[PDB]
Symmetry: C3
Subunit: 123 residues, 3 copies
């Protein structure tokens, strides 16, 4: 296997939060319902959502996309042991397929002020 | 040899510095003496410490963010020529063995306001 | 192919901005004209420029260059489709050859307050 693309995004949380206020609308366009909520039903706060949006931007960059994605065609989930994962369908899985990606590696991070993600696509 | 896990962490230096101030015992829970003490014996500055803790956090995420790992079981050192490295012992060395980790790649960085790191685990 | 080095850099945009305004000759030490200018001919804004500098700092780290690079021997450019790339010449190309680097992967990002980049070198 070989690296196909890498992506990084680092976002100020307060700014991301302000963007969600500006049309909401946005949240529904950015996130699947499953991304908004923990398995126990608790609602994610803004820093954690910012990290999930950063992962999607990082995936868009790893795929060489110029103007983002059909965001709902990408899904950040978390394995039982805690490792984040990306699931891609439709438009994003098509882009993935034409590049030859067989494997994503993703890491997410946040504190209250900064959220980040990195994605490595291999194939 | 293949990518097993990736980790990233990006932290506000001011926030890390606040946490260390809230709790004087925190520095010695996160760091070995070798990381805390500059040559000559002055305490390593907050920003440089923040980057090192970002590296241990990114290492944790590269290993799939598992239960039971002491921060002191990972050490950031700098080899001749300046590349950072990670020496792992005890709980962290056990987790890496178990995942079949053969080698690590790490980078870290800071300015006065923001510290960051990325870790790639290969096996 | 294996990973030879990794680099990350995350910068506060305002701090980078402040530095360039203290020493206005400095932009031309760090950046080629192609990096300073947008497709239309106007100077890139500070956040977008800080991402290109982050990418050079990340490249320097991936190459084990502790004192930084001869900056203008590295040029960040973007493929028609949207993927950023690093062209290296002179001292930087020479360093990559010394280390046996065969290919580079780069991603950069900014918002208004934070710029970042990650470089992976493989060979
Ligand atoms: Na030019």
């Amino acid at each position: 296997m070989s690296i196909i693309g890498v992506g990084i995004d680092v976002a100020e949380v307060e700014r991301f939060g302000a963007a969600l206020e500006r049309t909401p609308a946005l949240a529904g366009r950015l996130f699947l319902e499953s991304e908004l909520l923990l398995p126990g039903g608790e609602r994610r706060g803004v820093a954690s959502l910012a990290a999930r949006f950063a992962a999607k931007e990082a995936l868009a960059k790893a795929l060489g996309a110029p103007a983002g994605l059909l965001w709902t065609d990408a899904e950040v989930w978390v394995e039982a042991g805690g490792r984040p994962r990306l699931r891609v369908t439709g438009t994003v899985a098509a882009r993935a397929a034409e590049l030859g990606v067989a494997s994503w590696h993703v890491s997410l991070s946040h504190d209250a002020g900064i959220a980040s993600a990195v994605v490595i696509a291999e194939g």
